[PDB]
């Protein structure tokens, strides 16, 4: 019957895999088919839209691989009389200004970053580290707004709790994955031999995990590393390991809400011209660690751990 696209930039992340599963549920409930397409670069993104048009889709939810493609995506969709909703990553114009007219569903980036820095600080205090020999490694992706509000939020929180600003070191990552973060973290680590304990800040689980893998290769044991990711679902294989690592826990948001609600809203828009809210910020978050990740995922219906 009705076909709707669900396009994501990183199909390998459990985060997006979960959005896809909940979109399928929305399709089962409301009576539409979801076409699941991977759009890891700009080219694929525009070609995928043409492909959706050929398939007869009336609209799509999309997590763009590049916010600056916003204009192009809007132009092509209009050309095909397709409605568009953005999930997680906001479209921006050439200048970098947000395209506020496109409905957006996303997590509360600032608030969850702040919660990341509060939980880092707390766990540091629990361990008794001497602040004088401690440092924060912030692995940033500042060209991505959502990534930038999380890492700024986290650094702001650490500063607000009393962590010395001069011991916060930032390093850019070229890709939002383990290899990009690994590389980034490694170059920062050799510049700071004086540090005995590291807090690793990054916008998501993969970034933090690459930071943690680099620390391991430079000789730090788990007690001297605290990394708290963001996404939850993406850290299950780490939390499931037999031995504890420097990856202490993850902040679990609601990818399930993002996949169903964006899909449901697209459908009401397509099927009834019910126009969606322009901005839907989901604030849900829970900290998962080795001790509770299974309880918490099951309690949220993201079962198996
Ligand atoms: O790439 C991140 C993704 O891993 C998830 O955290 C939602 O936001 C996107 O920007």
**DSSP string over 109-150:** HHHHHHHHHHHHHHHHHHHT--GGGEEEEEEE-TTSHHHHHH
Same domain (yes/no): 176, 302: yes
**Alpha-carbon torsion angle 134, 140, 146, 151, nearest 10:** 10
Q: Is the Cβ–Cβ distance between 74 and 93 less than 8 Å? A: no
> Would you call 263 exposed, middle or buried from its count of C-beta atoms within 10 A (0-12, 13-18, 19+)?
buried
Answer yes or no: is the C-beta of 64 below 6 A from any ligand 1 atom.
Answer: no
Owning domain of residue 159: 108-253+285-305
Same domain (yes/no): 63, 145: no
Answer yes or no: is the C-beta of 19 below 6 A from any ligand 1 atom.
Answer: no
Same domain (yes/no): 157, 302: yes
Q: Which helix (H) or strand (E) holds 234?
A: none
Which residues are bridge partners to 108 per DSSP?
none
Alpha-carbon distance 113 to 100, whole Å?
Answer: 22
Residue whose token pair is 């993850």? 250
Nearest CA residue ID for atom 9, ligand 1: 88
Same domain (yes/no): 53, 147: no
Distance 132 CA to ligand 1 centre (A): 33
Same domain (yes/no): 75, 204: no
Q: Which helix (H) or strand (E) holds 190?
A: none
Same domain (yes/no): 125, 215: yes
Max CA pair span of the chain? 63
Q: Who contacts 48 (Cβ-Cβ below 8 Å, separation ≥6)?
A: 5, 7, 37, 39
- Side-chain-side CA neighbours of residue 60 (13 Å): 30
Alpha-carbon distance 15 to 290, whole Å?
Answer: 19
Same domain (yes/no): 220, 74: no
SS3 of 158-176: HHHHCCCHHHEEEEECCCC
In 3D, which of 119, 140, 113, 121 has the Cα closest to residue 197? 121
Nearest CA residue ID for atom 3, ligand 1: 204
Same domain (yes/no): 124, 139: yes
Same domain (yes/no): 144, 275: no
Alpha-carbon distance 198 to 135, whole Å?
Answer: 5
Q: Is the Cβ–Cβ distance between 218 and 190 less than 8 Å? A: yes
Alpha-carbon distance 206 to 229, whole Å?
Answer: 8
Q: No. of H helices and E strands in the chain?
A: 10, 12
Same domain (yes/no): 169, 216: yes
CATH number at residue 54: 3.40.50.2300
Same domain (yes/no): 103, 122: no
Alpha-carbon distance 114 to 73, whole Å?
Answer: 32
Alpha-carbon distance 235 to 232, whole Å?
Answer: 6
267: left (phi over 0), alpha (psi -120 to 50) or beta: alpha
**Domain total of the chain:** 2
In 3D, which of 88, 66, 141, 27 has the Cα closest to residue 279? 88
Answer yes or no: is the C-beta of 88 below 6 A from any ligand 1 atom.
Answer: yes
Strand residue runs (E) in the chain = 2-8, 32-38, 59-63, 83-87, 104-107, 134-140, 168-172, 197-201, 225-230, 247-252, 279-282, 286-289
CA geometry: angle 152, 157, 158, nearest 5 deg? 100
């Amino acid at each position: 019957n009705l076909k709707l696209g669900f396009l994501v930039k990183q199909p390998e992340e459990p985060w997006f895999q979960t959005e896809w599963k909940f979109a399928d549920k929305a399709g089962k409930d409301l009576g539409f088919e979801v076409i699941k397409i991977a759009v890891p670069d700009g080219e694929k993104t525009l070609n995928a839209i043409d492909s959706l048009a050929a398939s007869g889709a009336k609209g799509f939810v999309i997590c763009t691989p590049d916010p600056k493609l916003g204009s192009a995506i809007v132009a092509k969709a209009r050309g095909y009389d397709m409605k568009v909703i953005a999930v997680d990553d906001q479209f921006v114009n050439a200048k970098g200004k947000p395209m506020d007219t496109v409905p957006l569903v996303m997590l509360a980036a600032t608030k969850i970053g702040e919660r990341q820095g509060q939980e880092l600080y707390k766990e540091m205090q629990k361990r008794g580290w001497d602040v004088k020999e401690s440092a924060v490694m912030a692995i940033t992706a500042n060209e991505l707004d959502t990534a930038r509000r999380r890492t700024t939020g986290s650094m702001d929180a650490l500063k607000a709790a009393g962590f010395p600003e001069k011991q916060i070191y930032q390093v850019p990552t070229k890709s939002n994955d383990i290899p990009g973060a690994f590389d980034a973290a490694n170059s920062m680590l050799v510049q700071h031999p004086e540090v005995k304990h590291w807090l690793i800040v990054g916008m998501n689980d993969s970034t933090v995990l690459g930071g943690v893998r680099a620390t391991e290769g430079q000789g730090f044991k788990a007690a001297d590393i605290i990394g708290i990711g963001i996404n939850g679902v993406d850290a299950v294989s780490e939390l499931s390991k037999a031995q504890a690592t420097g990856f202490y826990g993850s902040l679990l948001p609601s990818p399930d809400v993002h996949g169903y609600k964006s899909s449901e809203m697209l459908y009401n828009w397509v099927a009834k011209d019910v126009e969606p809210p322009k901005f839907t910020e989901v604030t849900d978050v829970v900290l998962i660690t080795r001790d509770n990740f299974k309880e918490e995922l099951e309690k949220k219906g993201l079962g198996g751990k």
